[PDB]
Amino acid sequence: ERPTFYRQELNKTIWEVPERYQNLSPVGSGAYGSVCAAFDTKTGLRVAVKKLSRPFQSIIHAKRTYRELRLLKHMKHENVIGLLDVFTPARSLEEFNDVYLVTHLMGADLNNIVKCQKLTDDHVQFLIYQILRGLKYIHSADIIHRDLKPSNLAVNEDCELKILDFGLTRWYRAPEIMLNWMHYNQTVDIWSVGCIMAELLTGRTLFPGTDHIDQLKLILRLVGTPGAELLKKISSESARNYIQSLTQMPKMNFANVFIGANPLAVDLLEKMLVLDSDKRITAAQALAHAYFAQYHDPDDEPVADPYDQSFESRDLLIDEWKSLTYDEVISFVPPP
Numbered sequence: 001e002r003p004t005f006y007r008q009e010l011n012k013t014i015w016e017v018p019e020r021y022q023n024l025s026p027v028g029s030g031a032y033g034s035v036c037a038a039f040d041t042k043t044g045l046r047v048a049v050k051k052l053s054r055p056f057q058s059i060i061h062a063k064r065t066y067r068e069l070r071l072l073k074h075m076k077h078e079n080v081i082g083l084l085d086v087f088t089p090a091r092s093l094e095e096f097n098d099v100y101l102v103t104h105l106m107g108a109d110l111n112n113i114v115k116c117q118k119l120t121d122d123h124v125q126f127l128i129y130q131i132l133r134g135l136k137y138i139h140s141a142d143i144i145h146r147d148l149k150p151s152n153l154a155v156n157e158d159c160e161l162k163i164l165d166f167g168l169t170r171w172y173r174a175p176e177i178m179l180n181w182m183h184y185n186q187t188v189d190i191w192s193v194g195c196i197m198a199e200l201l202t203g204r205t206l207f208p209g210t211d212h213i214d215q216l217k218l219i220l221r222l223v224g225t226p227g228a229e230l231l232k233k234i235s236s237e238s239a240r241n242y243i244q245s246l247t248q249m250p251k252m253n254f255a256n257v258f259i260g261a262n263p264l265a266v267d268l269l270e271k272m273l274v275l276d277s278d279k280r281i282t283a284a285q286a287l288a289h290a291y292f293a294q295y296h297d298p299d300d301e302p303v304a305d306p307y308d309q310s311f312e313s314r315d316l317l318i319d320e321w322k323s324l325t326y327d328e329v330i331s332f333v334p335p336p
């Protein structure tokens with residue numbers, strides 16, 4: 001298009017990006033799009049460039065491509081990853097088959113920090129406060145991260161955090177979303193924050209489950225087996241049958257689990273790691289907790305503008321998802 005694009009082979013795939021993006025070096029992947037660390041000639045900054053993997057080769061991928069670009073273009077928050085640029089080597093909609101997304105390049109994720117260190121309490125407060133500040137904003141647009149974990153929580157140390165793969169791995173998942181979605185809310189992310197926070201304070205994974213049944217066993221040893229009040233609210237027969245079959249376990253006192261931690265941290269952990277999603281603290285409420293008195297500013301915890309996600313209910317053809325994505329690429333304006 002307007003810039004001159006250059007081709008190269010990175011990993012076992014062809015990358016075709018503009019001349020402003022130089023020295024592309026792989027970082028990592030998954031099953032949705034590998035990322036390269038790059039140098040922005042125009043800004044003099046290091047960027048992260050993601051090439052979407054076969055964006056329009058399936059109905060699930062085509063809608064996922066749209067979803068991701070809509071999510072990225074909408075979210076404008078300090079603790080939430082943001083879109084710097086979006087491009088395609090394609091000059092028209094007929095040749096459109098590749099999507100590239102550009103963000104800032106972060107220094108490290110939360111797995112890296114906990115390996116090379118044993119964090120302090122102010123360190124934990126600032127990290128957790130930032131994650132919560134970002135989730136309040138995400139949750140206000142009616143989006144649940146659903147897969148919050150240390151690998152999608154990244155820092156540009158300093159110690160300034162950004163949440164990565166929000167609206168679309170076992171150790172940080174809410175128990176309700178483990179044993180078939182027996183009704184769920186946004187606090188599904190709060191359970192994950194609890195798991196992350198506990199790991200930041202102890203240096204060890206809270207529940208390192210070897211499988212989906214062992215994961216549940218580990219969760220229940222700390223939080224206890226579901227009580228009378230909770231069991232009554234479970235409509236799924238198979239889920240109730242499963243719960244009823246486990247030997248009764250009491251809920252542990254978190255003061256005897258998190259030995260030496262700030263008492264305010266322990267109180268907060270108890271509020272986040274509650275079995276009942278109905279009783280679990282929210283992002284906005286957690287930001288008001290005393291543990292964050294040094295960081296909390298109710299005038300500096302913004303919410304998101306309204307986000308139209310009616311598209312989520314719509315069943316379209318690959319080429320309709322493609323055209324809709326094509327419009328979001330063309331219409332894009334940098335932050336700057």
Ligand SMILES: Cc1ccc(C(=O)Nc2ccon2)cc1NC(=O)c1cnn(-c2ccccc2)c1N
Pocket residue numbers: 027035048049050068071072081101102103104105106107108109154163164165166167168
């Ligand atoms: C380029 C890109 C495109 C999309 C998203 C993204 O979050 N997408 C979605 C999808 C839905 O909602 N958001 C993130 C990125 N950036 C990174 O992945 C990224 C940036 N810095 N590091 C990094 C570098 C070194 C260590 C740790 C992290 C990364 N892993």
